[PDB]
Amino acid sequence: TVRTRVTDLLEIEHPILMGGMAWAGTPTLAAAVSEAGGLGIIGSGAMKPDDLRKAISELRQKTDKPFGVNIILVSPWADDLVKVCIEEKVPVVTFGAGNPTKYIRELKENGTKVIPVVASDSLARMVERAGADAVIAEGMESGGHIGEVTTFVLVNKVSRSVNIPVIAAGGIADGRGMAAAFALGAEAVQMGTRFVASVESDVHPVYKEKIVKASIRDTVVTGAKLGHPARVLRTPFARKIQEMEFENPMQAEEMLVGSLRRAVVEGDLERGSFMVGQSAGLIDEIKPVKQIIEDILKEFKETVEKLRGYI
Amino acid sequence: TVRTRVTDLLEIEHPILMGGMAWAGTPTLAAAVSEAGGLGIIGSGAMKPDDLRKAISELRQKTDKPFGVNIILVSPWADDLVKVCIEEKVPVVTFGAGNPTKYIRELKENGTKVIPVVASDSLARMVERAGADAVIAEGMESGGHIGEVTTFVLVNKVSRSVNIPVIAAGGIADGRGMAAAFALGAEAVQMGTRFVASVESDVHPVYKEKIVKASIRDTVVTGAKLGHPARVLRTPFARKIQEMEFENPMQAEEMLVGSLRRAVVEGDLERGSFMVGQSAGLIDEIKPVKQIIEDILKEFKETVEKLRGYI
Ligand SMILES: Cc1cc2nc3c(=O)[nH]c(=O)nc-3n(C[C@H](O)[C@H](O)[C@H](O)COP(=O)(O)O)c2cc1C
Ligand SMILES: Cc1cc2nc3c(=O)[nH]c(=O)nc-3n(C[C@H](O)[C@H](O)[C@H](O)COP(=O)(O)O)c2cc1C
Numbered sequence A, B: 001t002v003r004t005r006v007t008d009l010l011e012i013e014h015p016i017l018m019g020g021m022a023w024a025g026t027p028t029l030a031a032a033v034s035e036a037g038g039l040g041i042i043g044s045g046a047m048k049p050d051d052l053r054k055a056i057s058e059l060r061q062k063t064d065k066p067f068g069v070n071i072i073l074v075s076p077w078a079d080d081l082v083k084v085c086i087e088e089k090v091p092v093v094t095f096g097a098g099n100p101t102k103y104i105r106e107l108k109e110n111g112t113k114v115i116p117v118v119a120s121d122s123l124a125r126m127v128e129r130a131g132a133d134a135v136i137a138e139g140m141e142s143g144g145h146i147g148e149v150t151t152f153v154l155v156n157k158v159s160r161s162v163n164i165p166v167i168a169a170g171g172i173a174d175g176r177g178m179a180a181a182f183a184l185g186a187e188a189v190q191m192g193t194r195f196v197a198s199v200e201s202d203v204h205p206v207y208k209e210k211i212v213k214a215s216i217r218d219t220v221v222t223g224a225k226l227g228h229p230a231r232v233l234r235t236p237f238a239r240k241i242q243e244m245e246f247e248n249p250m251q252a253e254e255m256l257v258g259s260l261r262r263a264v265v266e267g268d269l270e271r272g273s274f275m276v277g278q279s280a281g282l283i284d285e286i287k288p289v290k291q292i293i294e295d296i297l298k299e300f301k302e303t304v305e306k307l308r309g310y311i
């Protein structure tokens, strides 16, 4: 039903992206998102080029619909992962935090849509010129690495500053979020925590369920003094890291090495980084990916009719 | 034009509140907001009971429309300020951060509408029972004291948790904000920084203009380790306070004593706390209060028509 500049740009059915997620954005879960009319995205967080090549191929076994790949600029294999996306003709590439200008042009030579994740208007506009096709404006309530501006303000300001489509991310978990994000100027939404809490997800069921029971207050920011702030589930281990950032900052940096995997794969609460957004307190049950998208789209429609009721 | 449960509850024309502000919410500026169809609110931040009584009276010299008074629960004269509001029959009382349950019942005996400011659903619901008539859900992007949840998430979650009207605050500066806040479940909006940047305001013109030139990144949070976190303009003096919170926390607490006034009244950047929300980067000019309200209402309407275009 709903169609935007983002639906045209990606030949997509719904304006819903799956956030690139390291260790959580598997080919299985991204395929279900693409089959349901959204845009799944493989999270190449801790992947070597062979891992990504195999993941790309095993996603095309599960769907012929468009999909994307997410690359962390800080990754030791960022350059190689970009070339993997090129020679596999990945339709859409997403970039994590940083400035992916050095990769725009060659990805655009190959017909790949480039959508950087930004946390400021000045960087949104900087990549817009660099050639980017769209921009994901991610507020600080999101899970994983965060910026300093909230979704409510960032999406508004970025939309007015660039002419390419803006995709709101951070805190979106239902049809009200999409409506409000669209009201703020976005033309699609990207969700992470809402798509981890799906039956197609293969995260350790502890993870899914810590999301179900988490309130909107049950997150904290770790890594802020080390320069890389990230939002995780409020847990004793996370408070230990907040302390260790001040007292022993290098021992803290090693305490997080591989901490996301012990959360994702093994559901280890004592040594895991359960990256989640504040949206977790908006999530109350595990739903199949297609049901999530259709529920969000109907509620998005009903919210617009209510907003109409005021005129 | 636009009418909600909040417009009925307050016999107000538009669903726009002026945030209670200490040293900035003067009877002059709140009168202009009430005359323009919104709800001005006197900020009794640093007022003794005589100050508030005189301020209330000198507001009724400037308008006969409804208005409110904001009380800080931490104030040495909170109890006396509440009784002043009673014997002057103030129509609406707003409470700052904390739990104002001890004041609900007696204010409700006197025909005064009680609207606490909350930063969680559990406190929103707790005051809803205590008898509150509405609730201001204030996200962490707001100016002044802040909570831990962003507007995009808090307004959504609080609206579903209570049946009394929810008023979105924090990050709202234009008609898109109102539309998105309404989409999130609110039935009115409260603004602070947008109403400081008005010609009717009497803050030192440095203050207004530091708001004009501030981006959405030009704020920081001070007072977080001392327990009372507040969002101020990103300034060297504010960074000095962030440092002094760790090293000499009691010397820091005295560094903030009266720091809001040197900002408001004297525009002292070296010793002032320029409380502002991230919305400051959405504000580009100084406008008269009535123009602000009508611009916001028209843009609110045009945003709803755009949202309609997607069906
Ligand atoms: C477990 C987890 C891992 C994530 N990993 C990445 C990542 O590797 N790269 C990236 O750019 N974003 C990453 N994100 C952020 C998401 O892509 C998305 O932008 C964010 O989840 C949106 O916020 P939400 O959780 O409120 O929906 C991650 C998020 C989560 C929850
Ligand atoms: C200078 C200033 C002073 C404020 N003082 C108070 C106060 O004394 N009590 C209170 O409850 N809120 C206070 N606030 C918060 C406002 O009432 C309002 O909720 C907030 O400004 C909304 O965020 P916004 O600036 O993005 O519009 C203050 C805000 C500012 C900017």
Ligand code: NA
Pocket: A210, A211, A212, A213, A214, A215, A280, A281, A282, A283, A284
């Ligand atoms: Na939850």
Ligand code: NA
Pocket: B210, B211, B212, B213, B214, B215, B280, B281, B282, B283, B284
């Ligand atoms: Na500004």
